[PDB]
Each structure stands twice: as C-alpha cells, then as structure tokens.
Chain A
Amino acid sequence: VLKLSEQGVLDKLKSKWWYDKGECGSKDDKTSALSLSNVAGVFY
C-alpha cells in the first residue's frame, strides 16, 4: 500500500473513478461590474 501510494497509483485511481468517469465533468472571480445582461432590456 505504501509503495502504491508513493508511485501515484492511488491518486490516479481516485482521479479515474471519481472524475474521469464523472457525469458532470466540472472541476472548478466575480468582477461585480454590471454585465450587458443586466441592462439588455433597456437596449431592446
């Protein structure tokens, strides 16, 4: 187990079976400036 841990095998297995087989495939700032979407109606 220690040898596997140090060779990265456990990390890779976790990555594979949590993320690489992940339905979502999401792995992840707010400026707070108003965006065009906040005033689009007034342009329309």
Chain B
Amino acid sequence: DRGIQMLITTVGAFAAFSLMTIAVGTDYWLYSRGVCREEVMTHSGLWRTCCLEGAFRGVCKKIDHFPDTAEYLLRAVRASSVFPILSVTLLFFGGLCVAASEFHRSRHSVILSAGIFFVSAGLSNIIGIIVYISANAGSYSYGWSFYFGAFSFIIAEIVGVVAVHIYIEKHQQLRA
C-alpha cells in the first residue's frame, strides 16, 4: 500500500499546513464581549479583535497583547504567537521533505525527517494552544480558527505516524 501511504502523507501534509496557516491568519479564535475602539459581542484572533454587531460592526483593532517574570514571559510568548508560527514553519519543512522524497529516492532519511518534522509541529501546536488559553485566562466561546488549529494537530500527528511507517517498511524490506 506504498502508493496509498504516500498519497495519504502528501494530502495530509497539505491539509495540516493549510488548516494551520488559515488558523494563524483568520480572526475567529475567540467569541467574547470586548470592544473595538460600551462592550459588545466581538470575535478576536491571534492579532486583531473585531465587533460582531452594532454600529462599529466589521471594525477591527490590533489586540493590545500587553496591558512577575512568569506573567511577563507568558505575555511575551503569547504576543508573538511564537508557537503557532513555529508549527507552521515545521509543517512547511515536513511538506518540503515529503515532496523531495519522490525526486530523490536514493536517500531514505528524507521521509523519516518528514515524519519528525510533523511530530514536532504537533508538539509546538499543543504548546501554542496551552499558552493561548492560559493567556486568555489572565463568558466566551472558541471559533472555527481554534478548531482549525486543533485539526491541524491531529492530522500532523497522523501524517507523522504514516511517514515513519514508510521509512520503517523501506528499511525492513530492503534489509530483509
């Protein structure tokens, strides 16, 4: 099933990267009641907050991420969205390795490295989610951008597993 395995890997890598990039771009992480500048229903993301109703509806303002070392570091890390961006980077590199595999069948470690990138992307994603949620804590709901990030994590981990299976089976078959 190597053809199907590679198909799953490529489709999944693209899906994870697309979902994660959209999530980092779009502004439907959180539904709360803040202000785009009275408090009304809004819809914030990682960078901008926007009004969901009333006169200033459609108006968005840059999130004042800033207004205790730990509080400072959390605020810093959440302000820059280090971890969502790092997960996007690693998904990109994983996709590059998956693409490069076919054009260079000589070296095995390419697809292995793809797998490892994907796994690491998932871990960065988790850290991101935790930092985001924790920084918010310092009524509400989560939007579809948040869930895009979550589904990116799941798919990334699946693709990592499949990639490592491909590498394992190549070394198992060729060695014996």
Q: How many A-B residue pairs have CB under 8 A?
A: 15
CA gap between A44 and B128 in the complex, in Å:
11
Q: How many residues of B contact A (CB 8 A)?
A: 7
Q: Considering only CB atoms and an 8 Å cut-off, how many residues of chain A contact the other chain?
A: 6
A-contact bits for B25-41, CB 8 A (1 contact / 0 none):
00000000000000000
Nearest Cβ distance between residue B130 and chain A, in whole angstroms?
A: 5
Residues on the A chain within 8 Å of B96, using CB: none
A43 proximal to B (CB < 8 A): yes
State A40–B137 Cα separation when bound (angstroms). Answer: 11
Q: Does A35 contact B (CB under 8 A)?
A: yes
Residues of A within 8 A of B138 (CB): 37
The CA-CA distance from A32 to B118 in the complex, in Å, is 37
Q: Is A33 an interface residue (CB 8 A)?
A: no
Indicate whether B133 reaches chain A with its CB closer than 8 angstroms: yes
* B134 close to chain A: CB less than 8 A: yes
Q: Is the CB of A43 within 8 A of B137?
A: no
Chain A to chain B contacts (Cβ below 8 Å), 10 pairs: A35-B137, A36-B133, A36-B134, A36-B137, A37-B133, A37-B134, A37-B138, A40-B130, A43-B130, A44-B130
Other A-B pairs, 12, CB within 8 Å; known A35-B137, A36-B134, A40-B134: A36-B130, A36-B133, A36-B137, A37-B133, A37-B134, A37-B137, A37-B138, A40-B130, A43-B126, A43-B130, A44-B127, A44-B130
9 closest A-B pairs by beta carbon, nearest first, are A37-B137, A36-B133, A40-B134, A37-B134, A43-B130, A35-B137, A36-B134, A40-B130, A36-B130
